[PDB]
């Protein structure tokens, strides 16, 4: 599905992520534009042979099941296709854990070299939360 800016914003609090282990509401919005440009269906090809799925571009290597990526850890044990689903519900559930992985948001390339140190709470302004 093709999204736009505020159209998605509340659907994330619903899953329990505002200030989750301290990462506030402003810091997430930034990232999904950068890994998919508000669209659930985009996927990236990584030089490591793994692919990236969902708006978040989750990598087949440690978490999900695609099967084309051999020897990967299947920690999630979900279809990577689940990641692509029109219903957002799936992805989130295995995303929370990944921050628990200890690098936090430092697992994502964009947010790091593209989202830190900005007015993170600017992305959420004008809207009704």
In the residue annotation, 66 being an active-site residue is answered as no
Q: What is the 3-state secondary structure (H, E, C) of the chain?
A: CECCCHHHHHHHCCCCCCCECCECCHHHHHHHHHHHCCECCCCEECCCCCEEECCCCEECCCCCECCCCCCCCCCCCCEHHHHHCCCCHHHHHHHHHHHHCCCHHHHCHHHHHHHCCCCCCCCCCCCCC
* List 7, 18, 35, 66, catalytic entry: 35
101 is in an annotated binding site: yes
Residue of 7, 18, 48, 52 with catalytic role: 52
Q: Is 48 a catalytic residue?
A: no
Query: What residues are labeled active site?
Result: 35, 52
Q: Residues annotated as binding site for substrate?
A: 101
Q: Residues annotated as binding site?
A: 101
């Amino acid at each position: 599905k093709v999204f736009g800016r505020c159209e998605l914003a509340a659907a994330m609090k619903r899953h329990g992520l505002d200030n989750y282990r301290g990462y506030s509401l402003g810091n997430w919005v930034c990232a999904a534009k950068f890994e998919s440009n508000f669209n659930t269906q985009a996927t990236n090809r990584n030089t490591d042979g793994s692919t990236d799925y969902g708006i978040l571009q989750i990598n087949s290597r440690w978490w999900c099941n695609d099967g084309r990526t051999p020897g990967s850890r299947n920690l999630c044990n979900i279809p990577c296709s689940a990641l692509l689903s029109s219903d957002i519900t799936a992805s989130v559930n295995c995303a929370k854990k990944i921050v628990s992985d200890g690098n936090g948001m430092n697992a994502w390339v964009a947010w790091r070299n593209r989202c830190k140190g900005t007015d993170v709470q600017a992305w959420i302004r004008g809207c009704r939360l």
